């Protein structure tokens, strides 16, 4: 049953009540598991919008990085969970954290063809020039993968960056 589940599994399953009890019976709201994942990260990775909101409101650290330098943001960006991404951005989280996978939230959003995530990240100052291990930046990924709608959004932003440099 629920008692045999980690606080992380409860978050990921969207078990609001059970989670709410576990984090009040002890200070496990920011407890990292073996991979360094927090309950917030598990909720983000599984699209549990209501749980993400509850956790954030109750003091879950949105900026904590996992052992691979994963964030709740990068996990939610890779899956295109636009509402969760917005909530994390509203917390003032860093958007340019480079992880041990050679990724950033923007690179993940582009890779997943998640155009709304891409727009949000760019507005929060995500850098479209940061590259993967293989030397692909956000524009390079969009072009190669054939994500023309993402490419269009990045292009409009690049024009603005260019206008600022001139």
């Amino acid at each position: 049953g629920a008692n045999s589940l980690s606080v992380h599994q409860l978050a990921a399953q969207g078990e609001m009540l059970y989670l709410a009890t576990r984090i009040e019976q002890e200070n496990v709201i920011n407890h990292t598991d073996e991979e360094g994942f927090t309950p917030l990260m598990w909720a983000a990775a599984h699209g549990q919008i209501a749980v993400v909101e509850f956790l954030l409101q109750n003091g879950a650290d949105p900026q904590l990085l996992g052992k691979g330098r994963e964030s709740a943001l990068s996990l939610a960006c890779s899956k295109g969970y636009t509402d969760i991404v917005k909530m994390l951005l509203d917390c003032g989280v860093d958007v340019n954290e480079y992880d041990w996978n050679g990724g950033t939230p923007l690179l993940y959003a582009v890779h997943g063809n998640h155009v709304k995530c891409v727009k949000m990240l760019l507005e929060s100052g995500a850098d479209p020039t940061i590259e993967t291990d293989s030397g692909y930046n956000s524009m390079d990924l969009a072009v190669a993968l054939g994500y023309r709608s993402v490419q269009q959004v990045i292009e409009s932003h690049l024009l603005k960056l260019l206008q600022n440099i001139k």
Partner: peptide, 11 residues
Amino acid sequence: LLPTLPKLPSL
């Protein structure tokens, strides 16, 4: 059918 470990995809 239980939620899988969070994992970022390869890029």
